[PDB]
């Protein structure tokens, strides 16, 4: 849970600007858009990184390249690599980070409009963020369905297969016989309707607040390299302040910077620490963290 700054440079002044904006607009809410960066401190292994036990197990299993684990065609031809990744990444194996708890604090303070996440770890929900405020753009393991006929299956059927040694006899649909898989969006598949639908509604909400207070969209720990999720930032209203907390400037913040863009090069957990400080909520935060 302990963090430190990424470099000798201080980001407290930049983080202070954010707290100042929220101070001047006490009845405004914030929309977060997050990626893998906010869960790195949780110890979740990056399947694309050698030196991770997961990477080598997938390589030993003949996975051709990391992302084939999230490819429909590959899964149907050989589901073992995905099952192996699921065993290691299944929700419940990790604990939320300081940044995940920040989302909870904001909710408690009624300043959370929505959190759009590309992650499948569901640590936002595990941390106590309400279902209504979360948009898991790439799905999660909480639901399962047959890839052929769409029949619904309880998530526990899939989960029970992961505890077997070795993992074999994968879940097959008792209607059409095809493989059943967790509701995780694989490369090549459309995201769930709720993604576009909610962004449609939040986009109007954003544009309408510009004319009344002022909202704020904060992008954290994402390389903005996966679409359509990566299109959100450019679609934020020109008149709505965009904030980016990432080790490096990426996506629209790099391709089309905006005068009002606030860029903060900092670890998501350190950022959380500094924001809570500048907001004066250290007391409530500590309570949540110790709860």
């Amino acid at each position: 849970m302990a963090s430190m700054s990424v470099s000798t440079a201080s980001t407290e002044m930049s983080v202070r600007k954010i707290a100042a904006h929220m101070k001047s607009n006490p009845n405004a809410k914030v929309i977060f858009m997050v990626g893998a960066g906010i869960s790195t401190s949780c110890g979740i292994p990056d399947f694309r990184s050698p030196g991770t036990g997961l990477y080598h197990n997938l390589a030993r299993l003949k996975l051709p390249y990391p992302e084939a684990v999230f490819d429909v065609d590959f899964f149907q031809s050989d589901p073992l690599p995905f099952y192996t990744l699921a065993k290691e990444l299944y929700p419940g194996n990790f604990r939320p980070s300081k940044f995940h708890y920040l989302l909870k604090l904001f909710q408690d303070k009624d300043v959370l409009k929505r959190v759009y996440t590309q992650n499948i770890d569901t640590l936002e929900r595990q941390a106590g963020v309400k279902d209504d405020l979360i948009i898991e753009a790439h799905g999660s393991f909480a639901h399962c369905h047959c890839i052929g006929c769409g029949k619904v299956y309880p998530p526990q059927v899939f989960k029970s297969k992961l505890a077997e040694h070795p993992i074999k006899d994968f879940v097959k649909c008792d209607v059409c016989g095809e493989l059943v898989k967790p509701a995780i969006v694989f490369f090549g598949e459309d995201l769930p309707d709720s993604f576009s639908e909610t962004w449609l509604n939040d986009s109007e909400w954003l544009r309408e607040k510009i004319t009344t207070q002022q909202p704020l969209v904060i992008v954290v720990g994402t390389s903005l390299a996966v679409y359509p999720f990566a299109s959100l930032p450019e679609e934020i209203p020109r008149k709505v302040k965009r904030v980016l907390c990432n080790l490096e400037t990426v996506g629209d913040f790099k391709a089309n910077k905006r005068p009002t863009d606030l860029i903060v090069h900092q670890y998501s957990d350190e950022f959380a620490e500094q924001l809570v400080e500048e907001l004066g909520w250290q007391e409530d935060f500590e309570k949540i963290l110790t709860a």
């Binding site: 090549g188 995201l191 993604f195």
Partner: peptide
């Protein structure tokens, strides 16, 4: 909607 998940 935006299309299918991709790079």
């Amino acid at each position: 909607k935006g299309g299918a998940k991709r790079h």
